Amino acid sequence: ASEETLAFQRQLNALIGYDVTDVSNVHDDELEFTRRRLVTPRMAEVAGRDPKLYAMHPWVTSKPLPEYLLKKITNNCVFIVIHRSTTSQTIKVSADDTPGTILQSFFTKMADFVLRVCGRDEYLVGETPIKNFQWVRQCLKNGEEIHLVLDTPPDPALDEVRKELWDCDRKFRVKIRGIDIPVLPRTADLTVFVEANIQYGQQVLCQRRTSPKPFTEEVLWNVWLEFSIKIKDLPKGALLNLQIYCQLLYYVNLLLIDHRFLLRHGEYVLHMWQLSFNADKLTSATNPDKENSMSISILLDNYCHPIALPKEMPNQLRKQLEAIIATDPLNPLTAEDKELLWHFRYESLKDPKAYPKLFSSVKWGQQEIVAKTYQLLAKREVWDQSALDVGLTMQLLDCNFSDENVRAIAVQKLESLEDDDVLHYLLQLVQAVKFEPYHDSALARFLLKRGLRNKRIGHFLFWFLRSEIAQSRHYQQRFAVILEAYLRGCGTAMLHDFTQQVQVIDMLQKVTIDIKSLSAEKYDVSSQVISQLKQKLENLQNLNLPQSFRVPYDPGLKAGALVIEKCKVMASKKKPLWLEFKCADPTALSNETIGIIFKHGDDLRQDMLILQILRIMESIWETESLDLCLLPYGCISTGDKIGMIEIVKDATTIAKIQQSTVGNTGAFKDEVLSHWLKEKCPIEEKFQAAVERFVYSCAGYCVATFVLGIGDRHNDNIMISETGNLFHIDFGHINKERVPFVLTPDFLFVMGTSGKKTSLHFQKFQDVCVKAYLALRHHTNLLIILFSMMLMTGMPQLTSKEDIEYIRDALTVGKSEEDAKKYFLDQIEVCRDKGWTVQFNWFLHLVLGI
Numbered sequence: 134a135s136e137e138t139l140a141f142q143r144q145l146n147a148l149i150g151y152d153v154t155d156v157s158n159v160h161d162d163e164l165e166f167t168r169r170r171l172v173t174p175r176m177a178e179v180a181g182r183d184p185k186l187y188a189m190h191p192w193v194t195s196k197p198l199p200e201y202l203l204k205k206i207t208n209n210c211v212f213i214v215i216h217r218s219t220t221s222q223t224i225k226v227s228a229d230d231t232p233g234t235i236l237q238s239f240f241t242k243m244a245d246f247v248l249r250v251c252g253r254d255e256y257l258v259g260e261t262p263i264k265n266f267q268w269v270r271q272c273l274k275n276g277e278e279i280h281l282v283l284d285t286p287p288d289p290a291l292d293e294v295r296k297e298l299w300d301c302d303r304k305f306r307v308k309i310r311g312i313d314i315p316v317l318p319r320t321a322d323l324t325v326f327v328e329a330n331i332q333y334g335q336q337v338l339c340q341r342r343t344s345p346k347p348f349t350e351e352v353l354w355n356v357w358l359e360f361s362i363k364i365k366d367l368p369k370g371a372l373l374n375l376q377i378y379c380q381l382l383y384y385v386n387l388l389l390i391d392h393r394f395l396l397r398h399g400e401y402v403l404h405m406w407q408l409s410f411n412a413d414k415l416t417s418a419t420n421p422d423k424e425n426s427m428s429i430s431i432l433l434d435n436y437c438h439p440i441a442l443p444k445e446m447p448n449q450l451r452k453q454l455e456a457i458i459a460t461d462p463l464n465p466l467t468a469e470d471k472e473l474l475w476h477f478r479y480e481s482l483k484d485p486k487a488y489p490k491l492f493s494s495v496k497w498g499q500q501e502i503v504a505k506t507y508q509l510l511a512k513r514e515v516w517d518q519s520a521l522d523v524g525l526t527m528q529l530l531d532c533n534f535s536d537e538n539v540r541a542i543a544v545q546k547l548e549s550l551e552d553d554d555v556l557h558y559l560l561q562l563v564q565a566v567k568f569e570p571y572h573d574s575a576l577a578r579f580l581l582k583r584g585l586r587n588k589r590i591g592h593f594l595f596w597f598l599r600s601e602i603a604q605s606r607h608y609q610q611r612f613a614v615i616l617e618a619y620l621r622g623c624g625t626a627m628l629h630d631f632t633q634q635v636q637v638i639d640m641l642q643k644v645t646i647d648i649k650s651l652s653a654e655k656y657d658v659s660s661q662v663i664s665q666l667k668q669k670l671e672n673l674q675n676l677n678l679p680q681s682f683r684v685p686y687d688p689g690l691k692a693g694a695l696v697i698e699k700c701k702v703m704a705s706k707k708k709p710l711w712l713e714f715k716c717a718d719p720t721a722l723s724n725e726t727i728g729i730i731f732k733h734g735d736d737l738r739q740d741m742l743i744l745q746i747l748r749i750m751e752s753i754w755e756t757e758s759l760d761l762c763l764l765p766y767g768c769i770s771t772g773d774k775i776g777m778i779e780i781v782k783d784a785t786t787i788a789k790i791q792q793s794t795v796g797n798t799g800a801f802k803d804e805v806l807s808h809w810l811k812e813k814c815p816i817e818e819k820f821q822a823a824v825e826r827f828v829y830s831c832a833g834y835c836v837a838t839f840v841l842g843i844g845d846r847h848n849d850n851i852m853i854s855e856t857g858n859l860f861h862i863d864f865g866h867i868n869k870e871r872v873p874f875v876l877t878p879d880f881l882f883v884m885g886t887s888g889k890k891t892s893l894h895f896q897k898f899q900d901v902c903v904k905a906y907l908a909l910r911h912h913t914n915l916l917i918i919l920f921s922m923m924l925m926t927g928m929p930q931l932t933s934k935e936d937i938e939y940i941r942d943a944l945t946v947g948k949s950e951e952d953a954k955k956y957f958l959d960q961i962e963v964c965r966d967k968g969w970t971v972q973f974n975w976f977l978h979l980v981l982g983i
């Protein structure tokens with residue numbers, strides 16, 4: 134109430150990018166209600182987290198040491214280098230030593246502090262073997278030395294937190310007064326009607342319409358729509374989905390039972406959303422644009438105040454039930470399916486992998502059945518004792534499930550995840566909040582909790598939520614609330630860092646878009662815009678631009694001043710900015726700059742989402758002991774059609790390589806690529822390792838790009854580094870010739886296949902591909918749900934079942950390893966037939982605008 138907290142709220146909203154306090158666009162107090170109930174889990178988390186380990190955010194894994202890593206360590210002994218002001222000595226110890234033992238034994242080698250990584254804010258502290266430290270492992274895989282500088286621990290005082298019924302059997306019914314819209318489309322003579330639906334888990338319980346009338350600024354009806362489902366049957370989380378067809382054009386939703394288990398009555402003037410299926414169609418939020426959006430007026434039974442108060446087998450038949458429990462996640466169920474599935478509730482409760490199927494066979498539209506379902510969840514021994522399955526858990530948090538308890542059990546198994554895992558899945562869990570029927574939920578609380586309990590998670594949770602608040606008006610309110618609750622308990626240091634980051638970004642957002650303004654339809658990096666570019670950075674770098682700030686996609690990296698010289702404007706289409714900074718950390722064991730790219734034009738949430746499935750993929754290969762050398766570079770969506778991207782050093786586009794050894798034409802030489810790498814690394818040893826890198830990097834992207842359904846793209850959207858690593862890029866948007874994945878002649882060439890014959894490295898390729906293509910099939914269900922969620926919360930279009938199903942054909946579900954093994958190796962053949970065919974077509978399409 135004072136001026137203190139008042140100003141505090143002011144800045145909080147500036148970091149969120151939305152005024153959470155705002156109450157102009159709401160028909161109830163669910164938001165504020167949610168802000169208050171979060172205050173508890175927040176404070177409860179702040180108090181329970183050790184200030185020390187928290188301030189140092191140790192990054193560890195309790196997973197085994199992979200086969201490819203176990204291969205490098207020589208008899209439980211690793212070499213590390215410790216630094217201290219010019220002084221540098223190497224000490225080899227067992228991979229099982231504790232960071233304390235590394236110090237205790239240190240003091241007794243040469244005649245209070247902590248071991249940090251040189252150039253990064255990464256501390257190796259805690260009761261864990263040095264082998265369980267991600268950094269340590271990263272160095273091993275890349276075959277790099279482990280240089281650590283001994284300095285003083287960060288004062289855990291910098292993370293200080295500031296001062297703090299079922300008897301109304303009457304049928305349900307709702308009256309539609311009329312829809313209103315200030316202006317209508319040019320093409321007149323239209324017909325429209327209101328379709329009122331009783332939704333739940335995306336399935337329709339009941340449906341009613343109105344008499345189709347001509348389309349005009351005002352279209353009254355004053356018609357009562359009486360449904361069938363009794364008020365006693367309305368389940369918590371049911372939505373009254375009101376829609377309008379002309380084709381569906383506008384839609385709006387409203388929870389029938391509020392956050393207090395009360396019914397909904399009274400008059401309502403809901404401002405609808407327009408349609409350009411997907412997460413947005415499910416939002417309870419109303420459209421803020423009240424001066425241009427279509428509105429609708431309704432009325433709910435002005436009754437009293439109802440309150441939904443809180444609560445042997447024929448062997449052969451079995452074989453039938455099982456055939457369902459073993460059915461892929463995409464194949465729907467039939468009448469008999471659910472009926473047969475339901476009847477044997479307790480028998481289907483013995484196998485976890487059946488829950489998704491079982492719970493979707495429930496008639497939530499019947500109060501009786503719901504009550505029984507909960508009786509089932511009473512004895513969850515079989516579930517609570519089951520081993521966590523992220524795949525399965527996810528399946529319960531999608532659009533198909535709107536029941537609190539059901540979803541709550543999924544969230545309940547997530548609690549079992551260690552910080553390392555929470556980070557692999559963070560993006561998808563954050564996107565899953567969109568399927569929650571209320572703003573306050575088990576999942577919303579779980580993200581808050583885990584964010585406040587670890588700085589890394591908290592860091593990415595900030596950015597992920599922030600991207601949705603800045604771009605999504607459908608969910609920003611709910612997300613603005615979840616963020617606030619996080620910024621109110623992350624500490625004063627993090628609160629400060631986020632400020633520096635937001636500041637730097639906002640200042641670079643202006644340039645990025647102000648520079649693109651000059652020439653857009655014709656890529657011509659003017660000689661004047663070059664001087665005008667460096668010049669703008671000059672104004673910013675004056676004293677308003679934060680000297681130092683953490684790189685959003687790589688929190689451990691601290692960026693300093695801008696190396697204005699190396700900064701430029703890429704001669705691309707959307708004219709992105711190529712910036713470079715110095716590493717703010719003076720203990721950095723190098724001088725290399727930090728490259729960051731700012732682009733406008735492409736939706737960077739897609740790239741974000743895509744790069745994340747990749748991380749998961751690499752992780753999956755880790756379990757099956759495999760390394761494909763993917764390079765999922767950092768990418769963060771910051772706002773509408775804009776964000777940053779990590780810059781991979783010593784890397785070039787595969788097209789530019791052909792456009793230099795040949796020219797700006799479509800004639801592609803097969804030996805060009807190899808000639809490039811050879812002259813890049815004269816040292817035979819490097820070239821010998823660079824060629825093998827390609828073999829793996831190339832294979833790795835071929836499988837991932839295929840399963841994801843994005844293997845067919847131009848040559849310019851693909852890169853290779855001077856170390857031989859090939860990696861795809863720019864995932865903005867993605868009768869004729871087609872190809873499964875890019876495996877051009879110049880690639881095969883570098884593998885030995887100078888023509889259409891087998892080779893040494895080439896055989897290694899096919900061996901690794903198939904090998905990785907199988908490692909992913911073991912996680913078919915996990916990929917299905919991910920690919921499925923990604924399309925519902927990452928694609929502007931109204932993706933359908935046909936869209937998701939592709940993932941099922943790519944993974945060849947229902948087949949044996951043999952059939953699948955050959956299937957993949959044949960796709961590799963489809964590429965051997967096209968050769969340069971496809972690439973040449975992409976050249977005619979993009980370059981020649983044909």
Ligand SMILES: O=c1cc(N2CCOCC2)oc2c(-c3ccccc3)cccc12
Pocket residue numbers: 703705709766778779780781782784785786862863864
């Ligand atoms: O999204 C993108 C990611 C990248 N990357 C990935 C990380 O390392 C640096 C290159 O590069 C892009 C380029 C580009 C810049 C310089 C040279 C060639 C191409 C043009 C347009 C979009 C992207």
